[PDB]
């Protein structure tokens, strides 16, 4: 029977390095547009975190879009909070943003974030 | 003063989902070739884990290569072990592969893996 070696900080190091690539606009391959505001990102990270983006980039016709527009009623700061969460594991929920974040997370099909928002709403 | 919410399994979930994309050949954008053996991958994951791949894909001329050949003296199973490590955080070091893995990790400029190989060689 074999045992395995695991690196404690590997996954968080990968995410940190991917976020650095995003900050420097290195190998970014999509721009997300919400109400005339643009967010650059990596398609694979979006697909790994969002049921909506997974569905989009597995559709043959939509796979090669370089610009994706979201529903303009979405709050762009709610989107930005969720994009940062994707790349950092930290979710900046505050009393003044939780409803926007929850609505955006439902739209993006981020079920764990939605559950977390519901938890904090119920507690308060 | 603010505090932060962190998701314990987010980074490892992202890596798990990226590895599933790799297994299904979804959004893979590069093939690495070692001694006539091919490995499909995502450039951003390679860059996040390897100093060599970071250097390659930040070079303007090499950025848009779809096929990258490595030194044919490299052991392709050593490469495969390191590619799996990139996507899983688990490093399959064994008595029969540690020297090949170390040499490949030095070539790929994966300093933490190299340090780990040196640790196990010194202990045995």
């Amino acid at each position: 029977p074999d045992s395995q070696i695991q690196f404690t900080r590997h996954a968080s190091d990968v995410l940190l390095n991917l976020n650095r690539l995003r900050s420097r606009d290195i190998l970014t391959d999509v721009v997300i547009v919400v109400s005339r505001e643009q967010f650059r990102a990596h398609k694979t990270v979006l697909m790994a975190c969002s049921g909506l983006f997974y569905s989009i980039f597995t559709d043959q016709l939509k796979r090669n879009l370089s610009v994706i527009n979201l529903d303009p009623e979405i709050n762009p700061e709610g989107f930005n909070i969720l994009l940062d969460f994707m790349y950092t594991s930290r979710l900046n929920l505050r009393e003044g943003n939780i409803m926007a974040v929850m609505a955006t997370a439902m739209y993006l099909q981020m079920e764990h974030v939605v559950d977390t928002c519901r938890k904090f709403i119920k507690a308060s | 003063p603010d505090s932060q919410i962190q998701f314990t399994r987010h980074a490892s979930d992202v890596l798990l989902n990226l590895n599933r994309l790799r297994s299904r050949d979804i959004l893979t954008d590069v093939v690495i070739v070692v001694s006539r053996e091919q490995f499909r991958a995502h450039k951003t994951v390679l860059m996040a884990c390897s100093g060599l791949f970071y250097s390659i894909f930040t070079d303007q001329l090499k950025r848009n290569l779809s096929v990258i050949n490595l030194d044919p003296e490299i052991n392709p199973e050593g490469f495969n072990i390191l590619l799996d490590f990139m996507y899983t955080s688990r490093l399959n070091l064994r008595e029969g592969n540690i020297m090949a893995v170390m040499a490949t990790a030095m070539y790929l400029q994966m300093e933490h893996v190299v340090d780990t190989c040196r640790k196990f060689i010194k202990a045995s």
Partner: peptide
């Protein structure tokens, strides 16, 4: 430590 052992 940055490494740990776990079941195969």
């Amino acid at each position: 430590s940055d490494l740990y052992l776990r079941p195969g």
